Every structure is written in C-alpha cells, then in structure tokens.
Design a binder for this molecule. Sequence first.
Ligand code: SF4
Ligand code: FCO
Ligand code: NI
Lengths: 532, 287, 249
Amino acid sequence: KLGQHYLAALNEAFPGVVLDHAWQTKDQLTVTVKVNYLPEVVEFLYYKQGGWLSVLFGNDERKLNGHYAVYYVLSMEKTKCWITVRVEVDANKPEYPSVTPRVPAAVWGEREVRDMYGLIPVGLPDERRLVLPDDWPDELYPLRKDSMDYRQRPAPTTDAETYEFINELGDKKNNVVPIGPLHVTSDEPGHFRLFVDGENIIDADYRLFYVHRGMEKLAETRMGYNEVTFLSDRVCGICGFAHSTAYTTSVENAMGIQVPERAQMIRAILLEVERLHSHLLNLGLACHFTGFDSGFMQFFRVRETSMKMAEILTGARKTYGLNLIGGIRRDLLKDDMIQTRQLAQQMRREVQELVDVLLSTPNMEQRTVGIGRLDPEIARDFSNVGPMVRASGHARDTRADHPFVGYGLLPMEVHSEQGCDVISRLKVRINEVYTALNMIDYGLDNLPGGPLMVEGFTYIPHRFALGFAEAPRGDDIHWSMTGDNQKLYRWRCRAATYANWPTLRYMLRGNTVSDAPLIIGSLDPCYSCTDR
Amino acid sequence: SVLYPLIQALVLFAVAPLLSGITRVARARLHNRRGPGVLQEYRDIIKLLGRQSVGPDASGWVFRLTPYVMVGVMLTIATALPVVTVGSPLPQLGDLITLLYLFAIARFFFAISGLDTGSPFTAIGASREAMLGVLVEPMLLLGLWVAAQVAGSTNISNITDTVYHWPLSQSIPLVLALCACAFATFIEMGKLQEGPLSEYSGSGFGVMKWGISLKQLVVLQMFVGVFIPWGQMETFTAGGLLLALVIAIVKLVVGVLVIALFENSMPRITWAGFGFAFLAFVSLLAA
Amino acid sequence: LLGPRDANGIPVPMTVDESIASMKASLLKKIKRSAYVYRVDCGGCNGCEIEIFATLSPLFDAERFGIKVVPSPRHADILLFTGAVTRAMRSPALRAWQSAPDPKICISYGACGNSGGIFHDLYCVWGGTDKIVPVDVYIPGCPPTPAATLYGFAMALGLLEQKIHARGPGELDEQPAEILHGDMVQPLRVKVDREARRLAGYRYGRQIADDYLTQLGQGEEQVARWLEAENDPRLNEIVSHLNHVVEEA
Ligand code: SF4
Ligand code: FCO
Ligand code: NI
C-alpha cells in the first residue's frame, strides 16, 4: 500500500493528530486531522516531505456528519502517492486555521472557500472576493446545499466594479494599463492592471472569474453522472478531453470499475493528440508577439493536420464527448489507426522545419530572454504545475508520477529546462510535441484489444476519490463524491492554470508593457478552465 | 496660378486609398492569403462616412475638428509636391522648412486629439507618434539639406531639377542623402492592437483614414518625386502628360510594394538613417 | 445605471428607440460590401471564440466578403456576442454596446450566446445575450462551424437568405409509428444492438449491428461479406461477438 511511510512520519511528528485515515485506491490516501492543528500538518507534508499543494476545497457534509469538510490534497513526489488532509469545521461557527501564512499555494483555494461555502480561514491576509462577481449579495454562499436554489438570481447591487487592486511596489502616481476584460487577441475575458511607470511594469494586479458560470453547483443539482462528461467538455474547447478524463477517472476510482485494457490507453492516445492541438496553438501565438506572422499562419497549418487526426479519431472539432464512466463512447478502427501513425510522422517532419524559426534566433533571442522570469523559488512555494514549473527546473509531470490511463505502457519522457524565460517555456512545449508524437507512433500499433465498455454497475453512495489528467497547461485534479445511483454529492475541479495564475504578479514585474501580452501568453492561459 | 495646384491637391487626395489598398493587398499576398480587393479602402471610408461620429463626454471641439485639420494639412503638403513636372505647382509654399513644419502641425494636432480623449491607449499612441516625429524630422531635414546645398537653394523644384541633371561631380553627397531620405521615408511609413484611433468613430474615423492614407501618399511622394524626377517635365505641356501620370503612379506603386516587402523582411535603421545622413554631410566637407 | 431593470432590480434587455431602429435595413445595405465586426466575448468557453477567430484563417476567410475585425466598439457596425452573460460580464458587454455608434447590428454566436446553452438556468449567468441587448441574427452551434459563421454573416449582410424555419404541430404527429427492422424478433435485435454498442460505439454499433441485420438475410453469404470486405481485425471481432450473442440467444 502506497503512503504508509508518510503516514508513519506524520504519526511520529504528530502523535495523536490523525483522527482517521483511509485508502481510496492503492496510491490514494486521506487523513482526518485535528482542526486547530491543521496548518502544521500540511506545512510539514509540503516542506519537509516534498509535497505539492494540488487542490484544496470545502464541502457541505452537515447532513452526513454535522460538520463542514475542508480537504487539502497533497501530491507526494519524492513511492509517489496522494495524501488528502481533511478537517471537520464546526457548523454554526465555521472557522478553521488558515494555511496561507505557511504555504503560499493556499492563497486562492482559501479565498474560494470564503465565497462558495462561507467558511472563514482565520489569519488569511488576502480577504478579497475571488470567484463571485462584485454585484453578488453578501451572505448568499452558492455551494452551500441549503443557501439558495441553483436557479435563483439575485438583483445586482452595483453596475460598476467595486474590486480593490493592491499596489505592492507602486504608489499613487503610477498609471494603469488595462488588458481586459474586452481586449483583442485575448479572445477571453480577464482584467489586468499594469501599474506602470513609463513602459516598465512596476506592479501588476488582475481581476479574474469573469467567466464564472457556476457549474460546480449545477453538476450536483440538475445533472447526473454520464452527463457531467458533457459539462467537462464545455468548460474550454482545448482541455475538453483533459477535464473529461480527469472527471471519469475520479468516478472510476471511487468505485472499483476494472476498465477494459484498450479503453485505458486510447484515452492516453487522445490526451496526447489534444496537446498537439494546444501546444501548436500557443507556439503560433508565440510567433504573433515575437514578430513573425508567417510563423503563426504556418503553425496554424500544422495545427490543422493535428486537427485532421482529431477529425478522424473522433469526427469532431473542439468540444467532443468520447468518454463515459465505464469506458469510451465511439471506438477507433484499423485504418484510422494505421493512418494516424504517419500523419504523426509527417507532423514530426513539418514540426521540425517550422521549429527552425528559433534556430533563426533574432526576436527569439532578445524579446524572449530575461522576460517574464518565474523564480523556481517562487514556483515551488505557489505549486505551479504546467510548463512553467518544468521550465523553472522541477520535473513535475502527472504521467510519470501517477500513470492514470495506462501511460506505463507508453514511452514517457519528462522534459525540464533550467532557464525561466519565455523561450524556455517554448522549449518545454517543443520537446513535448516530439514526446507526444512518439506515443502516437508507439500507441496505435500495439493495441491490446478486448472490450470497450463496462456498464450496469451500481454507484455506491458517499464514495469519493481523486481523478487526475495531464492537461496541456498542467494537471487538472478532479475530486468527486458519489451521492447515489443518479446524482453527485459534490464534484470539485481545479484547472491546470488555477495553480499557475497567482504568480503572474512576479512575472510581469520589471518588464515592459509591450511584451506583457507575451508574458501572459507564455504560460498559455485557459480562463474558461480556471473561471469555471 | 490656381488651377494646377488645386487639381494637384484634388487628384492626390482622390488617389490616396489606392496606395493603402495596394499596400494591404500586398501584405495579404505576402502572408499567403487571397486578401481583399484594392478598392476595399474606398468602401471602408465611404461606409464610415455614412456612420455617425461618437466620442466621450469630456471631448470637445478638438476631437471632432482634428481629422479635417489633418486632411487639410496633408492637402497643403500635396499641393506643393511635384508629381508630373520638376516644378512644384506652388513654389512659394514648396520650401523645405515649410513642409517640415506643416508636418509638425499635423503631429501636434494628432497628439492633442489623442490627449483630448480620456483613453490611455490614444494618449500613449499620441506620445509614440510624437516620438516618431522627433526622431524622423532632423534626419529628413539633413537629407534634403545636403541635397539643397548640393543644389544651391532651400527649395523644392531646385533640388528636383538638380538631381534631374545629375552633376557626376558631387555624386557621393547625392547618393548618401538619397539613402538617408529613403531611410526617413521608411521610418515615417511604418513603426521603426488597440491603436491610437480607438476612440474615433463614424465620419471622424473615416476622415482619419483619409488623412492616414494621404500622409502615407505624401511621404513616399516627397521621396520619389523630389529624388526620382527622371520622367517629369521642366515646363508643363499638354501632350506628354499621360507619360508623367503613368510614371508617377508606377513609382508610387513600386514604392509601396518594396517598402511592404522590406518591412515584412525585418535602433539599427534609426542610427543608420542618422549615420547615412552625417556620411552625406561629411562628404561635402571632406571633398 | 448602465442597463434597465425591473422593480426587483433584475436586468432586462435594452429597448432601442424606433428612430434609432428605423434605419437598420439601410445600415445593412450600407455595410453589405464592408462590415466592421467587434467580437464581444462574454462568459463562454474558448470554442466559441477560437472558431470566430478562425473565420479569418487560411481555411475560411472573412476579408474576401468584406468583414474586418476591429479593435474598438467605436469602429464597430456589427457587435458579435459570444458567451452566456455572466453577472460579472453584463456590465462590460453593456459598455461595449453603448460605446458603438447607433444604429448597431448584434449577432449571437453559439448555443451559449443564444440562450445560455448548458448553463441556461444558473445563478451566475443571465442566460443568452438577448437577455441584455437586442439580437438581430442568431447563430447556433457548440461551437459553430466556420461554414455556419460565414452563412450567418452573409445572411446578416443580405448576401444569402434564411434557410430553416419553425415547424409546428400538424397531421404527421398523430400518424402511427412503425416497427423498425420488423423481420426478426425485437429481443434479439435489442440484445445485438446493446452488444454492438458495448464493443463499437453508439454510432459504430448501430452501424455494425444494421450491417449484421441485412446479413441475417443470408447467413453464409453476408457472414462472408462482413468477414472479407472490411479486412478490419476490429470489425471482424465486433461481428464474431455479435454472432455469438444471436446464436446463444
Ligand atoms: S456555445 Fe458552446 S463552445 Fe461556445 S461558449 Fe457556449 S458552451 Fe462554449
Ligand atoms: N490545459 C488545460 Fe484546461 C486549463 N487550464 C485543463 O485542465
Ligand atoms: Ni483550459
């Protein structure tokens, strides 16, 4: 059983704090600790044991045990397992000690739980509203199961935005350069405040969650089990198969569900095919701010032949719908599989020539070095997970630590650079394109065979687990608890860029105005995945 | 003395969106797309003239009245540039300082219009355009100043027919000044998103597009009519006029095509534009 | 302040004056040859945004028809609305509405923009884009294909005409339904349909089972067609398993 050593270390460091512990799967572990001793346990597992704060979230278990539940998912990466730290916040006085003064990665999860559930982490410095809009009435906490109906819409208190932006390094003489929410080539709402002195950015604050639909509440009220796979696809058009596989594996880990052999690694094939689509889009956007546009339209061309295998492996463009809880909906056939193999190869042909642009190295040496540097010291604290943390030096990858859809039968390579520039994050994505093309080269020629679907099973109530996938921008951790045979009790999703966002203040600092859209797009944000 | 400058200004006004249209279709063909037609700029300008102009509450008479001022200033420019003869239609206005400071009028009015609105983007674009004018004005002044002291007089239609009859004795000061003027034209027609016209709307935006197209015409025209005059007239006749119009429109078309090509082929040219200008100035002094 | 409200304070769609709305047809025939379109992305997934940006891509072009994307609402004659109106996004969308010069054309793009899509009844959305501003042209899809985007813009500009219309109740409602594939007993057909859906797919499974059904007419002959024509190992495994289900019945 994985995770015994960390539990023993927690027991010897803290003798009588672990009130209860249980195993979800072999590599999944949860512990219930004391409420007043919570920040020491998570800080210990974070700093001393080398754990990364993946996701933390609240729960409404007042009719299950009479208490709120705040979970703290930690990824052990020094074998490698999942540890969740659970606390039982009191009902009529919801207050638990905060982790943000100890672990900086707990700054927005503890701001989200102030809004969705109304729980109060005492000692949290950033007390501003995060997810709910500025016109939201105060005490309506949406994710409380008895606060309001999902269909209720309060009257907007204000038409103007009342958000407060902090200026850490600037003063009352600095000007601001908005870059949202309605900006061209941003293609997605998100506000930015560049506190500039000239063209240099002194400080940078931002307002997000303009695309907060509220699908966490809607996934547990109006919508079932097989239908949330459609909700996960319609979050963003480019992580659709990442969210669906992350949600599906959360529900199949919550029960047994011994999925058939080829239905695992076909999901591994389509997970990598999607990162051909998303990385080559970012590399096209990397050339549209570096300068050349005949490097963009051409990355659009190699993106189209990545869309051509996505046309034949599924038959759809963007949002799809190919996974169910037991297995995959539509199934690949022989010629599709022989064909995808050399269109993978001709892309490796085309990708090599198009990557000869950085070999050219003129705006790819002066515009993309020393710009938007992310400190690996900072990236370790805030627990970034995408190509950000792989460029900064940490070999953080879900497919190597935790093979979820049969990646152990596929050739896995983790690429980590040393520089922390924009050009370093492009080199992460360039080596990931060849890596994903090696898996398409080695996946579709040796399928194990067998069935595709496992259905007819009954959902055991109040069973939960963690589901994870390797999205193109990092990992998405999906935690879902089964409610009954039809509905979910609670489904929580954290986007790949949700962990990535709180370090944009430390990238845009010291840079210029002109390359500031390049710094934001260097990590390839998916606002719709993080805004939920 | 009135008909020739007025017809000059009217034709140079009415041919300006051909040069913008051919530039945008050249940029479209260079990026391997079919692109719009050459008359698309006229359709956009007329359609925007149909629409009604809106602006901020704080904006006053300057915001509405700037585009007409810039178009009129470009017309006062274009009425003194020779396009078909080596003689300017208005030699009184066809000086070197007069043209430069009328361009300064255009820069001043564009900058105060950008600062009239409360938008940060328009004020930023006004500041960048004023920076561009500060860095390009003495480059072009020294280019045509070297060409003028080669010629003898501070006056268009004197530099033009000095470089029409190539002396072959001061050729290096002429060639270096010609390349410096080419660099100044390259800086003015180019950089060297949100844009500085994000607050303009309707008829005001249409007249700004008129003025921008006319400015891009007159900068290239001040290059290719003053420094490339082989194909023009010493005195205005009524029989060789078609050849002059043909060579003028061909010069303008090939100019915008090659400038688009070398713009997409990209403080180097800022220093080299100054460097070739001083290399012209030292050349007379040493020789 | 920006938008009208009820007595409760809930926002309602704006009502343009008829003096302002009287010249929409003249504006359409004015911008028929040159349309200036500003994307107003609201609370929606990138799908409904990247495909709109793909309308000027190499595969599908918009400048050949005169459509040019503008950077400001002040330049806009057509305001393209994309996502479901989030409570945080109603005020910027309204600001983009009043910033544009009157009269305007509004095009709702996608299911999420037409009516809210899958988030139609939810506390943080106001529904579709027609709940805040008037909408002239509705373009459905999730995401709309670029052919649909070109058709929507061409029909908005008058180059094409509307194709689909409403269908109401009629005589065909009460005509009785017929048994489909009513040759063998319904149990086996249902069992082999489920067996093919487990192994192939919804789509592939109906297809394989229906091929098998036409081949139940001649056992050996079309067993042979399914075996030889495809030469697909996978299709052959699907047929063998379906055949064992029917045989054991
Ligand atoms: S219409 Fe579909 S793709 Fe577009 S924003 Fe709505 S859910 Fe996303
Ligand atoms: N990649 C991606 Fe979408 C985001 N952020 C997910 O997961
Ligand atoms: Ni995403």
